[PDB]
Design a protein around this motif. Structure first.
Motif, PDB file in Angstrom:
ATOM      1  N   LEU A 144      -9.782  10.258 119.965  1.00 16.50           N
ATOM      2  CA  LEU A 144      -9.913  10.806 118.621  1.00 16.50           C
ATOM      3  C   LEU A 144      -8.598  10.845 117.863  1.00 16.50           C
ATOM      4  CD1 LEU A 144     -12.355  13.840 118.802  1.00 16.50           C
ATOM      5  CD2 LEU A 144     -12.824  11.475 118.323  1.00 16.50           C
ATOM      6  N   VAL A 145      -7.475  10.909 118.565  1.00 12.37           N
ATOM      7  CA  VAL A 145      -6.183  10.835 117.898  1.00 12.37           C
ATOM      8  C   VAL A 145      -5.927   9.459 117.287  1.00 12.37           C
ATOM      9  CG1 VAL A 145      -3.698  11.040 118.112  1.00 12.37           C
ATOM     10  CG2 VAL A 145      -5.171  12.726 119.179  1.00 12.37           C
ATOM     11  N   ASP A 146      -6.298   8.409 118.011  1.00  8.72           N
ATOM     12  CA  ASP A 146      -6.077   7.048 117.541  1.00  8.72           C
ATOM     13  C   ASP A 146      -6.856   6.701 116.276  1.00  8.72           C
ATOM     14  OD1 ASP A 146      -5.309   4.246 117.527  1.00  8.72           O
ATOM     15  OD2 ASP A 146      -4.949   4.469 119.677  1.00  8.72           O
ATOM     16  N   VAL A 147      -8.112   7.128 116.212  1.00  7.75           N
ATOM     17  CA  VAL A 147      -8.954   6.847 115.052  1.00  7.75           C
ATOM     18  C   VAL A 147      -8.419   7.509 113.789  1.00  7.75           C
ATOM     19  CG1 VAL A 147     -11.355   6.582 114.375  1.00  7.75           C
ATOM     20  CG2 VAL A 147     -10.790   7.159 116.734  1.00  7.75           C
ATOM     21  N   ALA A 148      -7.989   8.754 113.938  1.00  4.18           N
ATOM     22  CA  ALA A 148      -7.474   9.571 112.847  1.00  4.18           C
ATOM     23  C   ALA A 148      -5.956   9.650 112.878  1.00  4.18           C
ATOM     24  CB  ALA A 148      -8.095  10.958 112.898  1.00  4.18           C
ATOM     25  N   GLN A 149      -5.296   8.553 113.230  1.00  8.93           N
ATOM     26  CA  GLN A 149      -3.847   8.518 113.386  1.00  8.93           C
ATOM     27  C   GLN A 149      -3.109   8.684 112.070  1.00  8.93           C
ATOM     28  OE1 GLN A 149      -0.943   9.219 114.854  1.00  8.93           O
ATOM     29  NE2 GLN A 149      -1.964   8.150 116.536  1.00  8.93           N
ATOM     30  N   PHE A 192     -17.362 -15.805 103.632  1.00  5.89           N
ATOM     31  CA  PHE A 192     -18.765 -15.513 103.356  1.00  5.89           C
ATOM     32  C   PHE A 192     -19.235 -14.250 104.066  1.00  5.89           C
ATOM     33  CE2 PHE A 192     -23.402 -16.711 103.659  1.00  5.89           C
ATOM     34  CZ  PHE A 192     -23.644 -16.658 102.298  1.00  5.89           C
ATOM     35  N   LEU A 193     -19.164 -14.235 105.396  1.00  4.55           N
ATOM     36  CA  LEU A 193     -19.704 -13.135 106.193  1.00  4.55           C
ATOM     37  C   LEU A 193     -18.730 -12.715 107.285  1.00  4.55           C
ATOM     38  CD1 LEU A 193     -23.428 -14.178 106.307  1.00  4.55           C
ATOM     39  CD2 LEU A 193     -22.814 -11.780 106.322  1.00  4.55           C
ATOM     40  N   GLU A 194     -17.470 -12.496 106.931  1.00  6.03           N
ATOM     41  CA  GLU A 194     -16.493 -11.987 107.882  1.00  6.03           C
ATOM     42  C   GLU A 194     -16.286 -10.491 107.678  1.00  6.03           C
ATOM     43  OE1 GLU A 194     -12.641 -13.688 107.401  1.00  6.03           O
ATOM     44  OE2 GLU A 194     -12.312 -12.825 105.411  1.00  6.03           O
ATOM     45  N   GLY A 195     -15.820  -9.831 108.735  1.00  4.89           N
ATOM     46  CA  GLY A 195     -15.439  -8.438 108.616  1.00  4.89           C
ATOM     47  C   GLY A 195     -14.116  -8.284 107.894  1.00  4.89           C
ATOM     48  N   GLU A 196     -14.001  -7.207 107.123  1.00  4.47           N
ATOM     49  CA  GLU A 196     -12.852  -7.030 106.249  1.00  4.47           C
ATOM     50  C   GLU A 196     -12.609  -5.543 106.042  1.00  4.47           C
ATOM     51  OE1 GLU A 196     -11.449  -9.945 105.438  1.00  4.47           O
ATOM     52  OE2 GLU A 196      -9.688  -8.920 104.618  1.00  4.47           O
ATOM     53  N   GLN A 197     -11.351  -5.186 105.796  1.00  2.19           N
ATOM     54  CA  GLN A 197     -11.000  -3.793 105.556  1.00  2.19           C
ATOM     55  C   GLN A 197     -11.522  -3.350 104.199  1.00  2.19           C
ATOM     56  OE1 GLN A 197      -9.832  -3.116 109.099  1.00  2.19           O
ATOM     57  NE2 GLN A 197      -9.212  -1.518 107.648  1.00  2.19           N
ATOM     58  N   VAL A 198     -12.234  -2.222 104.172  1.00  5.76           N
ATOM     59  CA  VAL A 198     -12.883  -1.785 102.938  1.00  5.76           C
ATOM     60  C   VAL A 198     -11.891  -1.206 101.943  1.00  5.76           C
ATOM     61  CG1 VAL A 198     -13.455   0.586 103.614  1.00  5.76           C
ATOM     62  CG2 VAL A 198     -15.068  -0.735 102.183  1.00  5.76           C
ATOM     63  N   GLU A 199     -10.686  -0.849 102.389  1.00  5.82           N
ATOM     64  CA  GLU A 199      -9.661  -0.416 101.451  1.00  5.82           C
ATOM     65  C   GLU A 199      -9.091  -1.595 100.683  1.00  5.82           C
ATOM     66  OE1 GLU A 199      -9.494   0.875 104.768  1.00  5.82           O
ATOM     67  OE2 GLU A 199     -10.504   2.708 104.110  1.00  5.82           O
ATOM     68  N   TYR A 200      -9.126  -2.789 101.272  1.00  5.99           N
ATOM     69  CA  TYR A 200      -8.663  -3.987 100.586  1.00  5.99           C
ATOM     70  C   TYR A 200      -9.751  -4.645  99.752  1.00  5.99           C
ATOM     71  CZ  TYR A 200      -5.974  -8.242  99.755  1.00  5.99           C
ATOM     72  OH  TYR A 200      -5.289  -9.280  99.169  1.00  5.99           O
ATOM     73  N   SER A 201     -11.022  -4.475 100.125  1.00  4.78           N
ATOM     74  CA  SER A 201     -12.103  -5.002  99.302  1.00  4.78           C
ATOM     75  C   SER A 201     -12.253  -4.217  98.007  1.00  4.78           C
ATOM     76  CB  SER A 201     -13.417  -4.996 100.077  1.00  4.78           C
ATOM     77  OG  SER A 201     -13.532  -6.151 100.885  1.00  4.78           O
ATOM     78  N   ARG A 202     -11.961  -2.914  98.026  1.00  2.00           N
ATOM     79  CA  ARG A 202     -11.968  -2.143  96.790  1.00  2.00           C
ATOM     80  C   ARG A 202     -10.757  -2.435  95.919  1.00  2.00           C
ATOM     81  NH1 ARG A 202     -14.236   2.220 100.627  1.00  2.00           N
ATOM     82  NH2 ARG A 202     -16.463   1.945 100.162  1.00  2.00           N
ATOM     83  N   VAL A 203      -9.715  -3.043  96.477  1.00  2.00           N
ATOM     84  CA  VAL A 203      -8.566  -3.467  95.686  1.00  2.00           C
ATOM     85  C   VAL A 203      -8.809  -4.839  95.066  1.00  2.00           C
ATOM     86  CG1 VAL A 203      -6.171  -4.273  95.981  1.00  2.00           C
ATOM     87  CG2 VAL A 203      -6.832  -2.006  96.769  1.00  2.00           C
ATOM     88  N   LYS A 204      -9.408  -5.757  95.833  1.00  2.00           N
ATOM     89  CA  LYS A 204      -9.710  -7.092  95.323  1.00  2.00           C
ATOM     90  C   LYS A 204     -10.772  -7.064  94.229  1.00  2.00           C
ATOM     91  CE  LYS A 204     -10.690  -9.015  99.218  1.00  2.00           C
ATOM     92  NZ  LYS A 204     -11.343 -10.063 100.059  1.00  2.00           N
ATOM     93  N   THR A 206      -7.472  -2.588 113.580  1.00  2.00           N
ATOM     94  CA  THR A 206      -6.645  -2.052 112.513  1.00  2.00           C
ATOM     95  C   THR A 206      -5.731  -3.162 112.023  1.00  2.00           C
ATOM     96  OG1 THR A 206      -5.218  -1.141 114.247  1.00  2.00           O
ATOM     97  CG2 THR A 206      -6.636   0.383 113.087  1.00  2.00           C
ATOM     98  N   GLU A 207      -5.129  -2.949 110.852  1.00  2.00           N
ATOM     99  CA  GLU A 207      -4.140  -3.900 110.356  1.00  2.00           C
ATOM    100  C   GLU A 207      -2.888  -3.885 111.222  1.00  2.00           C
ATOM    101  OE1 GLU A 207      -3.244  -4.552 106.393  1.00  2.00           O
ATOM    102  OE2 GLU A 207      -5.203  -4.018 105.560  1.00  2.00           O
ATOM    103  N   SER A 208      -2.509  -2.712 111.715  1.00  2.00           N
ATOM    104  CA  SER A 208      -1.346  -2.575 112.579  1.00  2.00           C
ATOM    105  C   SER A 208      -1.690  -2.999 113.998  1.00  2.00           C
ATOM    106  CB  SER A 208      -0.854  -1.137 112.569  1.00  2.00           C
ATOM    107  OG  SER A 208       0.418  -1.062 113.166  1.00  2.00           O
ATOM    108  N   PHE A 209      -0.920  -3.935 114.548  1.00  2.27           N
ATOM    109  CA  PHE A 209      -1.147  -4.358 115.921  1.00  2.27           C
ATOM    110  C   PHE A 209      -0.402  -3.504 116.932  1.00  2.27           C
ATOM    111  CE2 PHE A 209       2.748  -6.540 117.294  1.00  2.27           C
ATOM    112  CZ  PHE A 209       3.423  -6.639 116.103  1.00  2.27           C
ATOM    113  N   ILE A 210       0.486  -2.621 116.489  1.00  2.00           N
ATOM    114  CA  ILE A 210       1.222  -1.769 117.413  1.00  2.00           C
ATOM    115  C   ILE A 210       0.447  -0.497 117.752  1.00  2.00           C
ATOM    116  CG2 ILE A 210       3.181  -0.150 117.238  1.00  2.00           C
ATOM    117  CD1 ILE A 210       4.910  -2.469 116.590  1.00  2.00           C
ATOM    118  N   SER A 211      -0.297   0.054 116.791  1.00  2.00           N
ATOM    119  CA  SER A 211      -1.202   1.162 117.076  1.00  2.00           C
ATOM    120  C   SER A 211      -2.344   0.762 118.000  1.00  2.00           C
ATOM    121  CB  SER A 211      -1.786   1.710 115.780  1.00  2.00           C
ATOM    122  OG  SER A 211      -0.791   1.855 114.794  1.00  2.00           O
ATOM    123  N   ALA A 212      -2.668  -0.525 118.082  1.00  2.00           N
ATOM    124  CA  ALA A 212      -3.703  -1.000 118.983  1.00  2.00           C
ATOM    125  C   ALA A 212      -3.139  -1.447 120.324  1.00  2.00           C
ATOM    126  CB  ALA A 212      -4.473  -2.146 118.331  1.00  2.00           C
ATOM    127  N   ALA A 213      -1.937  -2.023 120.338  1.00  2.00           N
ATOM    128  CA  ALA A 213      -1.339  -2.452 121.594  1.00  2.00           C
ATOM    129  C   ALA A 213      -0.859  -1.285 122.434  1.00  2.00           C
ATOM    130  CB  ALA A 213      -0.167  -3.395 121.346  1.00  2.00           C
TER     131      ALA A 213
END
Lengths: 1334, 99, 49, 50, 79
Positions: free
Chosen positions: A784-789, A1232-1244, A1274-1281
């Motif tokens: 739960l810490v990682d999700v809400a980091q 067409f049908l790829e997964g994408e960050q919804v914070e960036y789709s609201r910017v585009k 996530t966009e950050s690969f260090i929070s996931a690694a």
């Protein structure tokens, strides 16, 4: 020193030579006689650096006068020995060997070639060939030829085809494919067929193929031709004490890489036959793979101990890697630990020993023994401190003054597990803690230990006073309740002092104040609890914050007057004029905090602890064997139940009763005999002091010490005196079932041997539960810490519209959360008004505090719309208005406060605690049915004919109090729109039967049901009144199985009699168990039935994981009428033919019972079948506000059942962190049908739906992920690694060329920077404007 | 047990563990999350750099206390560039994109 | 162990939550005084210098 | 000699320490009546009776 | 001041902005050698700079006004 980002990519063979300082040519480490590093080896000094500071190996140059020379006799640069930690070398491989990470990690090299991984390994093991380029049209590229088939095409072709083996073939296939032509091929033929399971096979390629065009990589670099070498001071060969050495495991792994590489250069010189050269290249592949990742391709290469050698990937990956053991947690200087014991201290103080505080504050003393002239140098202050002279203990007392220190008890389950205290020096060896902070640490003095930490700099000594001090933290951050409640001995002296006695001493005498109620007690003239009259004086703030007084005589005891000299001049007298148990002192402190502030609360909480400790010792309270009383009638209540166990025993011997009826009769008897013993002990305990005063006899509450510890709530409960006085219940053996006889003995009479061996079944069943569930809850809190980091409040008002509508939780039974508990602290979303309309209370957003809560208490409003956190419109964070009140402080939350770590620690902290017909109206309220469809039945009442209707109970004001669910076809004893009092079973149905009741009043004839084809003839031979029977699909005949049975309601003409007002034919199709009661020709009225159809801790983990339930509830996609398709091939179909919409069907099991029939219309987002529903479907059909209402109502029932109060905003702020990804359906900016960050789709779409374009933007779906899945994406690969799957994260981040821009809290702990939260939030906002302004 | 400054480890250059080694207390993962929930950012930065792993910045903090200047001048920890040499030894180019 | 005179009562918060209040007469009589023996090895080895 | 808290007894449900305490006081009043009859030097026959 | 800093967080407005101001003022009484405005009362510099704030003598602008005006006298005596 200064950087901004962290970029990761693949290493070119020219880049690995660029990091290098020389080539390793020999596996020799050092010389055995003189332990010096040999040339060209793994520790060589010409490559990696000198071994001593400014010295070559021979000794020609030394001592920093020669700094920039290279000693030509040996070749060692005269520099520092710190560069043996930073300099790398390389090995030139005699054959290119594949990387194990881009081959085995699921595949990054068979995804790019479109070769199967089970077929690439036949080429790598030198087993079968592969065609590199077939010039003649016979063979194709990437065609696998066996060694007996390669010889045939060798003779037929000669030069005309290219075919190799090993990784020199796969290096050629990666070098030959054009990456640009395949993006110009896969974008061409994708429009042919967009089938579903082949689509993400293509999208796996296109995002990889475009990554090698954009990110600058090249696909040949998967195959390693040059291998880098770690610096020697990261894999040391150090000498131990007794003449031994101790090495790393990497030196053994680098030696067999070099030895099998030098031997390959010896086989290419002697012209060895091509079986010896193939086995050597297959042996070099094993040695390079075991160095990078040991136990992955085959059997792990063990050392000489039979445990496997620790490879390079094992130093990064796992719990004992660099990311979790040396980067996120560290060993720390200026710190110690000791055993804690109880304090006389104030709330902001702690007792630190003098032998402990001399070692922690040691350089602070040297800075004042030098400044005061008491020591002429620093190494003379080292002599005086170690001697412990008389001036050392007078300078330590000036260093420690006003210097706070942090006290830490592990495990730190929430943030109050580390607080700051100002030290008071004591002469001992144990830390002295305050008794009121023991609840926050969860600390008792049975051997516990706590750690001390000294804040060093000047900004760490002000955060310890302004953020982490012990008086700053008196409220909780999970819920708003206080955390400084006095626990067990303060409540006993308060319960004893503010008690009442009928006959004590000094009854009725009149006193001129509280100051002589202490003169009477101390001189023995009056008793403590004794009814007198005291002239008191209390103060109030009826004025604008000014104190107004009043004086009158009260009717109180002596002991309640001595307590009034503590209550600090702003409170009423009715707060101390009661018995004052544990919950009454817990809200006496809360009344002080809300009227008077923080400073009169800390003083009042200490003086309660001084007065509770003092009068609990004046009394003298014990426990003897006479305080555990027995009811006199205990033997005869058991003998009344010992008679009824042999009465049922002979019925088992005669045979009238079965064992199944006997078992729940013996269990029912002992569950009611236990209650009479548990009641006759409480009639013998709470009033057994039958005492008299100036008369015959009276009755008062007793002074028994085990009852006084329970009535005050000091220690124990009523359920624990039960095992002391009455029998201790029935005990369950650990199979799940219950032993037939109870433990009829208690701990005062003593158990038996068989009664004691039974009790150790369930005392180890619960003890092995507590030991084996703290691991299951420490993994949930880490997830739960990682999700809400990185969720930080980064705004003030995002200016969005409405969010979650709030409502009571009155379902099932009584009120559990009223409106004053769910809404207090939130912010109103829209302009809300009263049942008496046109009274706006808000400028569309106010903080709804306690005074506005009482304004909602007055009126009949019971539904508000508040600003939630899922609906917040801020990109990358939330605003302070969508979060509401900061619970730990009591105002609106600030900016830069890390609310995602507060959320995870508030859900994971109680996780170690909680592993373990007829509808009757109860109260005078109206009857209202909403979303209703009904029909006036055959008697004069109402019956329900829809699934979406529920019973609502409205009192005389306008709110709903009770709520019940009523099925389709039930029978209601009253009607709608009425006002009926309680005590009436108003709704009734058969719990077996699911009826098919009809709205239409008309005759019914037999039609389209022929015996032997769809129906059978079964009559009830006892009665005779029966009909035809319709079974399910798996039972009828194959004659007319494809046609549905259609019982038509007829008239005198023979027409389907319609629902009045509507034109569609409404006659029931017949599913299973449909047996009509009456025969052909009989008429049914309105509301007359045709037929009758008879009949903990992992839960919180699987909700946040968003698991798939085993039998999911099937739902509907669109409105309109439904129909059926196929019959019994795997599963059935659900043909949807709406009134307007377009042939959707679904593989649906027809043995799961349905709700609608073949002729009934169903709406979108409605329920089709029965069972639990998956959380992935509630977001797909219903909105983003209906899946957050489902989760915070389902994960709260586990918590609130245990009496655990957590605010609902802590769940919505990690549900928001699951709804963070978005799939697209259209295009115009991205694919067409790829997964994408919804914070960036609201910017585009904020760049294209605005004036830069008319409309080329993208419309998007919304996805939901579990916590262990949304934290790795996530966009950050260090929070996931640094969390999980370091191998799988870093391989998919290095072939894509990702960069980390260091926004999270976890990503700045690693690089040693300030946190973008709290005090460091003002620092990072300078950097975000330094980036744009040059 | 107590310790101000003592011996440090070989590869990672962090202090040792245990009373027999004169080692410091472990400031684990759960105690970092409590310093982030408080908001204490300068307390957390000093425990990651100058209390533990920053070699050139923990000898400056020692003299700054004897001089009477409670000021921390932090650097990059020695455990982070031990990690950078290990991912680069896996054939993966990881770098810092500086200003 | 030893067997000594125990009263069951709360004494001014010094036995708050599993704490124990002991008397000075127990310390003067050396009732719970224990002897611990230790071993300290000093080994001198061959060194190349 | 030692003062123990009485609130650790009922919630933990170990009533051995209350019965061991009452029997230890019953076993000390016999050693105190022997120690009285030994300092007072009564007889070897009255010490045989008690 | 010493026991509680509750009275100081209204004169600045934030728990997080109080630390970044009071550590800038107590830096000046540590190494800058500037004089405290309140009585010292044998207090450390962190407690004095907190005590100066809650009697309204130190703000974020006052630390910016006095530091900018101190440079402009040094920017006169040199040239």
């Amino acid at each position: 020193e200064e950087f901004d980002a962290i970029k990761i990519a693949l290493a070119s063979p020219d880049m690995i030579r660029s990091w290098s300082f020389g080539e390793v040519k020999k596996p020799e480490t050092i010389n055995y006689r003189t332990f010096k590093p040999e040339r060209d080896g793994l520790f060589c000094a010409r490559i990696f650096g000198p071994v001593k500071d400014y010295e070559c190996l021979c000794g020609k140059y030394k001592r920093l006068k020669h700094r920039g020379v290279i000693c030509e006799k040996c070749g060692v640069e005269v520099t520092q020995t710190k560069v043996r930690r930073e300099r790398m070398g390389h090995i030139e491989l005699a054959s290119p060997t594949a990387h194990i990470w881009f081959l085995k990690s699921l595949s990054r090299i068979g995804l790019l070639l479109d070769m199967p991984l089970r077929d690439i390994e036949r080429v790598l093991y030198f087993e079968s060939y592969v065609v590199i380029e077939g010039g003649m049209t016979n063979l194709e590229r990437q065609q696998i030829l066996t060694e007996e088939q390669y010889l045939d095409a060798l003779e037929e072709f000669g030069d005309e085809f290219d075919a190799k083996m090993g990784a020199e073939a796969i290096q050629a296939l990666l070098k030959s494919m054009d990456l640009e032509q395949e993006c110009e091929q896969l974008r061409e033929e994708l429009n042919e067929t967009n089938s579903e399971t082949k689509r993400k096979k293509l999208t796996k390629r296109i995002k990889l193929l475009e990554a090698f065009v954009q990110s600058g990589n090249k696909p040949e670099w998967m195959i390693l031709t040059v291998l880098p070498v770690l610096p020697p001071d990261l894999r040391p060969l150090v000498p131990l004490d007794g003449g031994r050495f101790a090495t790393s495991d990497l030196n053994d792994l680098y030696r067999r890489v070099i030895n099998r590489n030098n031997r390959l250069k010896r086989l290419l010189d002697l012209a060895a036959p091509d079986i010896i050269v193939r086995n050597e290249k297959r042996m070099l592949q094993e040695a390079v793979d075991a160095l990078l990742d040991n136990g992955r391709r085959g059997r792990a290469i063990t050392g000489s101990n039979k445990r496997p050698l620790k490879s390079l990937a094992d130093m990064i990956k796992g719990k004992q890697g660099r990311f979790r053991q040396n980067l996120l947690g560290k060993r720390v200087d200026y710190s110690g630990r000791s055993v804690i014991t109880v304090g006389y201290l104030r709330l902001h103080q702690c007792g630190l020993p003098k032998k402990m505080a001399l070692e922690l504050f040691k350089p602070f003393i040297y800075g004042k023994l030098e400044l005061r002239g008491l020591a002429t140098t620093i190494k003379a202050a080292k002599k005086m401190v170690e001697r412990e002279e008389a001036v050392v203990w007078d300078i330590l007392d000036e260093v420690i003054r006003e210097h706070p220190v942090l006290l830490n008890r592990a495990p730190t389950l929430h943030r109050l597990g580390i607080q700051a205290f100002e030290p008071v020096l004591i002469e001992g060896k144990a830390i002295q803690l305050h008794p009121l902070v023991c609840a926050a640490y969860n600390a008792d003095f049975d051997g516990d230990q706590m750690a001390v930490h000294v804040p060093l700099t000047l900004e760490a000594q002000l955060e310890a006073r302004a953020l982490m001090m012990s008086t700053n933290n008196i409220l909780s951050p999970a819920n708003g309740e206080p955390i400084i409640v006095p626990s067990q001995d303060v409540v006993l002296g308060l319960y004893y002092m503010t008690r009442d006695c009928v006959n004590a001493k000094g009854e009725g005498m009149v006193l001129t104040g509280p100051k002589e109620a202490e003169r009477l007690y101390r001189s023995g003239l009056a008793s403590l609890h004794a009814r007198v009259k005291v002239r008191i004086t209390e103060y109030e703030k009826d004025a604008n914050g000014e104190l107004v007084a009043k004086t009158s005589l009260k009717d109180t005891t002596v002991g309640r007057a001595i307590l009034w000299m503590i209550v600090p001049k702003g409170l009423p007298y009715s707060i101390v004029n009661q018995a004052l148990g544990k919950k009454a002192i817990s809200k006496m402190l809360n009344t002080c905090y809300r009227i008077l502030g923080l400073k009169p609360t800390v003083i009042f909480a200490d003086q309660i602890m001084y007065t509770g400790f003092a009068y609990a010792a004046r009394s003298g309270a014990s426990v003897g064997i006479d305080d555990m009383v027995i009811p006199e009638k205990k033997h005869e209540i058991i003998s009344e139940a010992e008679a009824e166990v042999a009465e049922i025993q002979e019925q088992f011997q005669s045979g009238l009763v079965t064992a199944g009826e006997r078992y729940n009769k013996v269990i029912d008897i002992w569950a009611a005999a236990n209650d009479r013993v548990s009641k006759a002990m409480m009639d013998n305990l709470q009033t057994e002091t039958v005492i008299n005063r100036d008369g015959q006899e009276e009755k008062q509450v007793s002074f028994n010490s085990i009852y006084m510890m329970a009535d005050s709530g000091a220690r124990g409960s009523a359920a624990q005196i039960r095992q002391l006085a009455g029998m201790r219940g029935l005990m369950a053996k650990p199979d799940g079932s219950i032993i037939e006889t109870p433990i009829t003995a208690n701990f005062r009479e003593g158990l038996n041997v068989l009664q004691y061996f039974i009790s150790t079944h369930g005392a180890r069943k619960g003890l092995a539960d507590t030991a084996l569930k703290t691991a299951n809850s420490g993994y949930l809190t880490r997830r739960l810490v990682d999700v809400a980091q990185d969720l930080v409040v980064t705004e003030d008002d995002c200016g969005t519209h409405e969010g979650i509508m709030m409502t009571p939780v009155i379902e099932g039974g009584d009120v559990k959360e009223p409106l004053r508990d769910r809404v207090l602290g939130r912010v109103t979303a829209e302009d809300v008004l009263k049942p008496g309309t046109a009274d706006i209370l808000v400028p569309r957003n106010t903080l709804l505090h306690e005074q506005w809560c009482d304004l909602l208490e007055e009126n009949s409003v019971d539904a508000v719309k508040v600003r939630s956190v899922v609906s917040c419109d801020t990109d990358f964070g939330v605003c302070a208005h969508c979060y509401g009140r900061d619970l730990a402080r009591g105002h609106i939350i600030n900016k830069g406060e890390a609310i995602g770590v507060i959320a995870a620690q508030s859900i994971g902290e109680p996780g170690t605690q909680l592993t373990m017909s007829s509808i009757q109206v109860k109260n005078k309220g109206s009857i209202k049915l909403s979303n209703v469809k009904s029909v006036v039945n055959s008697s004069g009442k109402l019956v329900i004919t829809s699934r979406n209707t529920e019973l609502k109970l409205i009192d005389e004001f306008g709110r709903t109090k009770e709520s019940y669910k009523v099925p389709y076809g039930a029978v209601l004893a009253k009607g709608d729109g009425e006002q009926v009092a309680g005590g009436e079973t108003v709704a009734n149905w058969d719990p077996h039967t699911m009826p098919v009741i009809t709205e239409v009043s008309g005759f019914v004839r037999f039609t389209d049901m022929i015996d032997g084809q769809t129906i059978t003839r079964q009559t009830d031979e006892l009665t005779g009144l029966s009909s035809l029977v319709v079974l399910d699909s798996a039972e009828r005949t194959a004659g007319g199985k494809d046609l549905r049975p259609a019982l038509k309601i007829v008239d005198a003409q023979g027409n389907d009699v319609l629902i009045p007002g509507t034109d569609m034919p409404a006659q029931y199709f017949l599913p299973g168990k449909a047996i009509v009661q009456l025969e052909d020709g009989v008429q049914i009225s309105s509301g007359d039935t045709l037929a009758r159809i008879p009949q903990g801790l992992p839960r919180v983990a699987d909700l946040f994981e968003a698991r798939r339930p085993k039998e999911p509830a099937i739902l509907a996609e669109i409105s309109g009428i439904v129909s059926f398709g196929k019959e019994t091939k795997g599963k059935r179909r659900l043909v949807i033919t709406p009134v307007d919409g377009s042939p959707y069907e679904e593989m649906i099991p027809k043995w799961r019972q349905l709700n609608v029939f073949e002729g009934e219309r169903v709406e979108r987002g409605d329920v089709i079948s029965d069972g639990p529903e998956a959380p992935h479907d509630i977001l797909r059909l219903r909105g983003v506000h209906a899946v957050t209402r489902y989760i915070v109502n389902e994960v709260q029932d586990v918590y609130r059942l245990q009496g655990v109060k957590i605010n609902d905003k802590h769940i919505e702020v990690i549900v928001r962190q699951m709804l963070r990804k978005a799939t697209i359906v259209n295009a115009g900016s991205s694919d067409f049908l790829e997964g994408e960050q919804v914070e960036y789709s609201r910017v585009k779409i904020a760049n294209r739906e605005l004036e830069a374009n008319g409309k080329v933007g993208a419309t998007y779906s919304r996805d939901l992920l579990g916590i262990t899945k949304a934290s790795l994406a996530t966009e950050s690969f260090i929070s996931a690694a640094s969390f999980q799957e370091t191998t799988r994260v870093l391989t998919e981040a290095a072939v894509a060329g990702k960069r980390d821009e260091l926004r999270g809290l976890k990503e700045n702990v690693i690089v040693g920077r300030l946190i973008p939260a709290g005090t460091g939030y003002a620092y990072h906002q300078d950097r975000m404007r330094r980036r744009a302004a040059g | 047990h107590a310790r101000s400054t003592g011996s440090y480890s070989l590869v990672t250059q962090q202090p040792l563990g245990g009373k027999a080694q004169f080692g410091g207390q472990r400031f684990g993962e759960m105690e970092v999350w409590a310093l982030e929930a408080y908001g204490a950012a300068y307390t957390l930065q000093e425990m990651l750099t100058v209390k533990s792993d920053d070699v050139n910045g923990r000898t400056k903090m020692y003299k700054n206390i004897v001089d009477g200047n409670h000021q921390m001048e932090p650097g990059m920890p020695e455990s982070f560039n031990v990690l950078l040499k290990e991912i680069r030894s896996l054939g993966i180019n990881i770098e810092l994109e500086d200003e | 162990g030893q067997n000594m005179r125990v009263a069951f009562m709360p004494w001014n918060g010094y036995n708050f939550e599993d704490s124990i209040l002991v008397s000075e007469r127990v310390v003067q009589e050396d009732r719970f005084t224990t002897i611990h023996i230790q071993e300290l090895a000093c080994v001198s080895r061959d060194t190349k210098l | 000699d030692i003062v123990l808290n009485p609130l650790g007894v009922p919630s933990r449900m170990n009533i051995g320490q209350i019965l061991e305490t009452h029997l230890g006081m019953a076993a000390k009043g016999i050693g105190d009546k022997i120690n009285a009859m030994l300092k007072q030097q009564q007889e070897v026959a009255k010490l045989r009776e008690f | 001041a010493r026991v509680t800093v509750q009275d100081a967080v209204e004169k600045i407005g934030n728990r997080f902005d109080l630390v970044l101001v009071a550590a800038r003022r107590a830096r000046q009484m540590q190494v800058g050698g500037k004089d405290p405005l309140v009585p010292e009362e044998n207090d450390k510099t962190t407690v004095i700079a907190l005590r100066e704030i809650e009697e309204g003598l130190i703000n974020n602008q006052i630390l910016d006004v006095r530091e900018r005006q101190e440079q402009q006298e040094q920017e006169a005596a040199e040239l």
